[PDB]
């Protein structure tokens, strides 16, 4: 149960540019002095007691670390080390510096559904790895879908940010309200038992956006968004979906399901004919279906 | 009605940060023309419905609309509103005496009669809002401020109308918001909201004021939400050994899941802990004390 390292992080690491942050965490590029190899340092601020406004609980820090220690897959971020000082716990993580998937897609000259599906398959492969280990990510959304390097022809996806991830336990009910409203399943909004299915919903949301530039449930305010989610009110309006294949629409429709039991599981998603064509006729349809990147760019730029 | 389009810094000298909440920063200011001091709340405007940051126009207009309606001695008073390309700026009454709980934490001695003095001020403020069908929706200690620490019994101002909402008869309002420690079950459970949620939050505030302890606060949000939704709390003698039965009964009527059964603001004002009916009740309340040591220990942890 490797103890967290008590030595000063700056004594063993050079610290460079900010990569990002959340509410109680900041991420910075770093380099281990002894090896010269680069990583990302995630500084998580510790709480004072339990009614502290600021900082993350020990339970929550330790859960994130436990889960990260378990994971070794080519589509998931890998943990290098953990340090702790008076104010923070510092996670030294694989450096993933190629930006968000969506930023890369926004710069393309064109995108086919075949190309789209080989990005989505990479996400599905990392999620399958997690789900096989009974790990739910619980924060699947475009900003946590990162690329190693944006300058190879077909960039490699890494799932990041395990701050909400949780191990699903046999016969135990897990209920909580968390995440970004746009991307959360109805069981989160409704304070109902949660499990691996919630990740599958989020995958339908990400796929919908990827293909269209629009978001299925997003309203003018949070109040509207929550109402849309819980009533599963979304469309495939021709404004945004004119170019989309029927199999793409079927894939999404099978993920954006309220009843957790009826939603595709990760292995069912992987086998779905949009991802895994059954014949050449279908492979052709998928190759010839394009994404309107204009709409995609328009909406991605607006999120910035 | 229109927001002022002139540059706020042309009419105000702008000073130190006093607070920096959600997508809002509050700074001290003085209006050049009059010499009078105020607080300037700068609210970042959202750029798109899924902009990562900023606040929707709907939400800004709602806070302003509500602020424009409220004029009461226990409620912050709006002075003016300015808008630029970036922000909408609310010029508010400057409330400089700090948080109520910080004042209470310095005291040597606090009786329940004194505590009810402060609670009644909150109830008066809330009564004024509720009569206008305005739910505050963010009642918690950090929004209960003082004008001036240096009078015998300081004057309370309810601040921070960022979550406030007008409650319309027959129109269902459902949403999930607020600070978990302080939110009512109907918030957690995504059920119809109204004026009752504020009453729950008053019970929580009261519980904390009297004990230093928080009724539903768990080790993590997951535990807090389960505590709230099951209405799981206690009056542990560790924290409540000094507390009167009157005070416990007031709390017990507010920390109720069933919205219809929860005390209303008028019922809270008439409760005998607040408004004794006889001298026997008055003496019990006067003689019951708060253990300020526990209060202090717990308030300093929030620091
Ligand atoms: Cl802790
Ligand atoms: Cl876990
Ligand atoms: Na499409
Ligand atoms: Na907003
Ligand atoms: Na619910
Ligand atoms: Na007490």
Residue numbers in the entry:
A (entry chain A): 1 to 304
B (entry chain B): 2 to 304
Would you copy out the relevant sentences from the publication that reported this structure?
Members of the DAPK family are generally involved in both apoptotic and autophagy pathways and share significant overall sequence similarity with myosin light chain-related kinases and triple functional domain protein-related kinases (Temmerman et al., 2013). DAPK1 and DAPK2 bind Ca2+/CaM through a closely related ARD, which is inhibited by phosphorylation of an identical ARD residue Ser308 in both kinases (Shani et al., 2001, Shohat et al., 2001). They also contain a basic loop (BL) in the kinase N lobe next to the kinase active site, which has been identified as a DAPK-family-specific signature motif (Tereshko et al., 2001). We found an identical type of dimer arrangement in all three kinases that involves the BL of the CD. In terms of functional implications, CD dimerization in hDAPK1, hDAPK2, and hDAPK3 is likely to inhibit catalytic activity by directly occluding the kinase active site.
The hDAPK2 crystal contained two of these dimers per asymmetric unit, referred to as chains A/B and C/D, which provided an additional assessment of experimental error (details described in the legend). The second main dimer interface is formed from positively charged residues on the DAPK signature BL segment, which belongs to the most mobile areas in the DAPK structures. In DAPK2, the main residues that contribute to the polar interactions are Arg47, Arg50, and Arg53 as well as the active-site residue Glu100 and Asp220 from the loop preceding helix αG. By contrast, in the DAPK2 structure, Glu182 is blocked by an interaction with Arg303 from the ARD, which acts as a pseudosubstrate. DAPK2 comprises an additional C-terminal tail segment that is predicted to be unstructured, and which has been shown to contribute to kinase activation via another dimerization mechanism that has not yet been fully characterized (Shani et al., 2001). The fitting procedure identified a mixture of 51% hDAPK2 monomer and 49% hDAPK2 dimer as the best solution (for details on software used see Supplemental Experimental Procedures). This could result from pseudosubstrate-type interactions of the N-terminal part of the ARD with the CD active-site area, as observed in various CD + ARD structures of members of the DAPK family, which may occlude the ARD segment from being accessible for Ca2+/CaM binding.
